[PDB]
Scaffold this active site. Structure first.
Site, short mmCIF file in Angstrom:
data_model
loop_
_atom_site.label_atom_id
_atom_site.label_comp_id
_atom_site.label_asym_id
_atom_site.label_seq_id
_atom_site.Cartn_x
_atom_site.Cartn_y
_atom_site.Cartn_z
N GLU A 131 31.59 37.12 50.20
CA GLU A 131 32.23 38.69 50.65
C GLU A 131 31.21 38.34 52.63
OE1 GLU A 131 30.07 39.78 48.28
OE2 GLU A 131 31.26 40.98 46.62
N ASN A 154 37.33 41.06 43.92
CA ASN A 154 36.92 42.41 43.26
C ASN A 154 36.52 43.44 44.09
OD1 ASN A 154 35.98 45.08 42.03
ND2 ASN A 154 35.87 43.69 40.58
N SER A 162 50.59 46.67 52.30
CA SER A 162 50.49 46.16 53.82
C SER A 162 49.48 45.34 54.64
CB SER A 162 51.24 47.86 54.48
OG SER A 162 52.08 48.31 53.86
N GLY A 163 50.66 44.86 55.44
CA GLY A 163 49.49 44.08 56.71
C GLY A 163 49.34 42.69 55.99
N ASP A 176 57.59 42.92 43.05
CA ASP A 176 57.65 43.47 43.92
C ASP A 176 55.75 44.32 44.45
OD1 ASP A 176 59.00 44.06 47.07
OD2 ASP A 176 59.45 46.49 46.07
N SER A 177 56.08 44.46 46.23
CA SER A 177 54.90 44.14 46.98
C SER A 177 54.82 46.17 46.96
CB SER A 177 54.62 43.79 48.08
OG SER A 177 55.35 44.13 49.07
N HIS A 230 51.75 49.45 61.49
CA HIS A 230 50.87 50.78 60.98
C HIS A 230 50.11 50.75 59.78
CE1 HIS A 230 53.17 49.50 57.01
NE2 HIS A 230 52.29 50.00 56.34
N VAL A 249 32.53 45.50 43.47
CA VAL A 249 31.58 45.00 43.48
C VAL A 249 30.98 44.39 44.45
CG1 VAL A 249 30.51 43.56 41.32
CG2 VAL A 249 32.39 45.81 40.49
N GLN A 262 52.72 50.10 48.27
CA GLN A 262 51.35 50.81 49.03
C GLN A 262 50.10 49.73 48.84
OE1 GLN A 262 53.26 55.08 47.67
NE2 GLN A 262 52.41 55.05 50.04
N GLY A 263 49.53 50.09 49.91
CA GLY A 263 48.19 49.37 49.94
C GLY A 263 48.56 47.69 50.10
N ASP A 287 56.39 44.93 63.22
CA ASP A 287 55.81 45.90 63.01
C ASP A 287 54.59 44.68 62.39
OD1 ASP A 287 53.55 47.83 61.01
OD2 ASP A 287 54.81 47.70 59.48
N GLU A 347 36.96 38.57 49.09
CA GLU A 347 37.05 39.30 48.52
C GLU A 347 37.78 38.96 47.20
OE1 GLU A 347 34.97 41.90 48.22
OE2 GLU A 347 34.74 42.93 49.87
C1 LIG Z 1 53.08 54.79 56.84
C2 LIG Z 1 54.17 53.90 57.59
O1 LIG Z 1 54.60 53.72 58.44
N1 LIG Z 1 54.70 53.35 56.14
C3 LIG Z 1 55.48 52.09 56.15
C4 LIG Z 1 55.54 51.11 55.07
N2 LIG Z 1 55.43 52.36 53.97
C5 LIG Z 1 56.55 52.27 52.72
O2 LIG Z 1 57.06 50.65 52.84
C6 LIG Z 1 56.63 52.88 51.30
C7 LIG Z 1 55.60 52.13 50.35
C8 LIG Z 1 55.74 50.62 50.77
C9 LIG Z 1 54.42 49.89 51.60
C10 LIG Z 1 54.79 47.72 51.32
C11 LIG Z 1 56.01 47.22 50.78
C12 LIG Z 1 56.68 48.29 49.79
C13 LIG Z 1 57.74 47.36 49.19
N3 LIG Z 1 58.93 48.16 48.21
N4 LIG Z 1 57.52 46.10 49.31
C14 LIG Z 1 56.52 49.41 49.79
N5 LIG Z 1 57.91 53.12 50.98
S1 LIG Z 1 58.86 54.15 51.01
O3 LIG Z 1 59.66 54.38 50.30
O4 LIG Z 1 57.64 55.43 51.01
C15 LIG Z 1 58.63 53.96 52.59
C16 LIG Z 1 60.00 53.53 53.30
C17 LIG Z 1 60.41 53.74 54.54
C18 LIG Z 1 59.53 53.74 55.91
C19 LIG Z 1 59.69 53.73 57.19
C20 LIG Z 1 59.23 54.62 58.28
C21 LIG Z 1 57.79 55.22 57.42
C22 LIG Z 1 57.77 55.99 56.31
C23 LIG Z 1 58.78 55.38 55.23
C24 LIG Z 1 58.28 54.89 53.82
C25 LIG Z 1 54.58 52.89 53.89
C26 LIG Z 1 54.37 53.91 54.43
CA LIG Z 2 33.89 42.67 46.53
#
Ligand SMILES: CC(=O)N1CCN(C(=O)[C@H](Cc2cccc(C(=N)N)c2)NS(=O)(=O)c2ccc3ccccc3c2)CC1
Ligand SMILES: [Ca+2]
Length: 223
Positions: free
Chosen positions: A62, A54, A177-178, A171-172, A40, A57, A174-175, A84, A52
Site C-alpha cells: 500500500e 483488503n 463510484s469513481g 452491476d456496479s 460526485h 488490513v 454505491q461505493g 461527472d 490496495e
Molecule cells: C451522490 C450522488 O451524486 N449519487 C449519484 C450516483 N448514485 C447512484 O447512482 C446510486 C447508487 C449507484 C452508484 C454507482 C453505480 C450504480 C449502478 N447502478 N451502476 C448505482 N443509485 S440511485 O438510484 O440511488 C441514484 C440514481 C441517480 C441519481 C442521480 C442524481 C442524484 C442521486 C441519484 C441516485 C449515488 C448517489
Molecule cells: Ca490494505
C-alpha cells in the site's frame, strides 16, 4: 460490485481507493501523480490509497498519499450527473511498480459490445447493504446507445454510456463510484450512476472518458 468476483490481490494495479476515515469512492491512476475519479465523489480531506486489496488490513504494497488538489469538471451538473469527472493531484508521486501502475487513456471511443472490466469496493447486494474487504471485479459489455436511451429516457447525454446486463443481477453499485471501466487496456469509463443496483432493465451509466481526453491533458499540463 453486485454479481462480481474476487479480483485477486493487486490484479488491477491502477485501482485507487478514496479514503476519509473509510472508503467512499474509487478512482484510477493515470500517471504517477494524477488520479481520475467522479465529480460526485468530491470531498475535502481525501487520502488516496494505492496498491490496495483488503482495505481494512495493512498487508504490504500500500501507498497512502494525500490529495493536493481536486479538480471537478467546471460544467459538472449535480442533478443530471453530466460531466461527472474529477482529477486528483497527489501531494507526492506514487512509487510505480508491479502492484501499483497507471492505466492508459483512450485514443478513440469504444463501441457497443466491447467487454470491459469494472472494479471496486462498493456494495455487493441489490437489496440491502454488504461491503467487501477485498476488491471485486465484473466483466460487462458496453450497450448500444439505443438500448441505453430506452432504459433511461431523457437522462442519457453524449458524455455517458451504459454497460452491464439488462437481465439484472450484475452491476456496479454505491461505493464503486469513481472507479474504472477498462476496455482493451484503456480507461473508457468512470462509474457514475444507475437506478438502484443490478435491477432488471436498469444498467449502469458511466462517464464517457474518450470525450474528456483533451480536457484531462490540458488540465494536467497546466497544473
Ligand atoms: C451522490 C450522488 O451524486 N449519487 C449519484 C450516483 N448514485 C447512484 O447512482 C446510486 C447508487 C449507484 C452508484 C454507482 C453505480 C450504480 C449502478 N447502478 N451502476 C448505482 N443509485 S440511485 O438510484 O440511488 C441514484 C440514481 C441517480 C441519481 C442521480 C442524481 C442524484 C442521486 C441519484 C441516485 C449515488 C448517489
Ligand atoms: Ca490494505
Amino acid at each position: 460490485i453486485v454479481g462480481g468476483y474476487t479480483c485477486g490481490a493487486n490484479t488491477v494495479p491502477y485501482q485507487v481507493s478514496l479514503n476519509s476515515g473509510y472508503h467512499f469512492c474509487g478512482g484510477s491512476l493515470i500517471n504517477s501523480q494524477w488520479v481520475v475519479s467522479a465529480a460526485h465523489c468530491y470531498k475535502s480531506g481525501i487520502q488516496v490509497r494505492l496498491g490496495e486489496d483488503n482495505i481494512n488490513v495493512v498487508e504490504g504494497n500500500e501507498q497512502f498519499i494525500s490529495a493536493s488538489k481536486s479538480i471537478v469538471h467546471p460544467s459538472y451538473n449535480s442533478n443530471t450527473l453530466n460531466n461527472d469527472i474529477m482529477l486528483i493531484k497527489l501531494k507526492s508521486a506514487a512509487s510505480l511498480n508491479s502492484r501499483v501502475a497507471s492505466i492508459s487513456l483512450p485514443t478513440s471511443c469504444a463501441s457497443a459490445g466491447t467487454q470491459c472490466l469494472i472494479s471496486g469496493w462498493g456494495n455487493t447486494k441489490s437489496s440491502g447493504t454488504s461491503y467487501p474487504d477485498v476488491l471485486k471485479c465484473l466483466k460487462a459489455p458496453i450497450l448500444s446507445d439505443s438500448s441505453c436511451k430506452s432504459a433511461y429516457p431523457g437522462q442519457i447525454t453524449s458524455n455517458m454510456f451504459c454497460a452491464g446486463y439488462l437481465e439484472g443481477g450484475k452491476d456496479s453499485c454505491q461505493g464503486d463510484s469513481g472507479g474504472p471501466v477498462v476496455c482493451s487496456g484503456k480507461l473508457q469509463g468512470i462509474v457514475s450512476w444507475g437506478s438502484g443496483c443490478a435491477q432488471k432493465n436498469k444498467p449502469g451509466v458511466y462517464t464517457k472518458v474518450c470525450n474528456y481526453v483533451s480536457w484531462i491533458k490540458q488540465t494536467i499540463a497546466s497544473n
